[PDB]
Amino acid sequence: RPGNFLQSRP
Amino acid sequence: PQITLWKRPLVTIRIGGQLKEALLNTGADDTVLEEMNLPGKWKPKMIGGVGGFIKVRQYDQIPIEICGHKVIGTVLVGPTPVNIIGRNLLTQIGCTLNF
Amino acid sequence: PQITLWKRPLVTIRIGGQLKEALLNTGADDTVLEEMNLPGKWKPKMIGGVGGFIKVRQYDQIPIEICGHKVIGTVLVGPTPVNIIGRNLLTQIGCTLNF
């Protein structure tokens, strides 16, 4: 499953 | 509360009269939720993650409840595989990382 | 200590006797670092996030110092945009979320 949810406002 | 991290930190949120499950995410600048409708204007945005970028809809000043905290902020809507609560709202609830 | 979330919770880590900045990421199950060398056997893994998956090398039983706490555990290496400290190691330093 997906398991790394880093999120970037560029 | 103090939440240990042996498990994914999933909590209940309330937004747009809907209850949803979401992930408390210190690694996300923003809050992004699966496809849904919100009222009012929006603006397109691109956000980036571990495996690349997705396009989202940016909605401002949306009221949202997170673990009995009634807050208001920016909410992004698009194809995230998990509802994500990011730093923009975590700060609003006084959330810190402690060790 | 207690880290606030107005900014990215970045910390200094030491791995392979090299100092780097990495992100304390409660939304990540695993720890993934930008392309580098680590010693020993490894195996390939896919990991996914917002926007898709990347292929990484899984190294086990790797020593890594995180904000002065020395732990040993599984470290992934591949094309992540940033160094990420995930729940597998957050739990080892006794890191919690608190609000």
| B36 and B77 Cβ atoms separated by less than 8 Å | yes
| B77 and B59 Cβ atoms separated by less than 8 Å | yes
Domains and CATH numbers, chain C: 1-99 (2.40.70.10)
* Block residue for tokens 């040993």: C72
CB pairs under 8 A between A and B: 43
State the Cα angle at B50 between C61 and B6, rounded to 5°: 50
| B24 and C26 Cβ atoms separated by less than 8 Å | yes
Q: Give the Cα separation of C92 and C58 in Å (integer).
A: 18
Q: Where are the alpha helices (DSSP H) in B1-99?
A: 87-90
Tokens encoding B32:
């992004």
- B38 to each of B32, B77, B78, C25, C64, how far by Cα in Å? 13, 9, 12, 28, 43
Report CB contact under 8 Å: C28, A3.
yes
- C57 to each of C22, C38, C41, C44, C47, how far by Cα in Å? 18, 10, 9, 5, 10
In terms of Cβ atoms closer than 10 Å to its own Cβ (0-12, 13-18, 19+), residue C95 is: buried
Method: X-ray
Q: Give the Cα separation of B47 and B87 in Å (integer).
A: 14
Q: Give the Cα separation of C54 and C30 in Å (integer).
A: 13
**Resolution in units of Å:** 2.1
Show residues of chain A in contact with C29, CB under 8 Å.
Answer: 3-4
Contact status of B35 with chain C (Cβ, < 8 Å): no
Report CB contact under 8 Å: C26, B26.
yes
Neighbours of B44 (CB within 10 A): 9
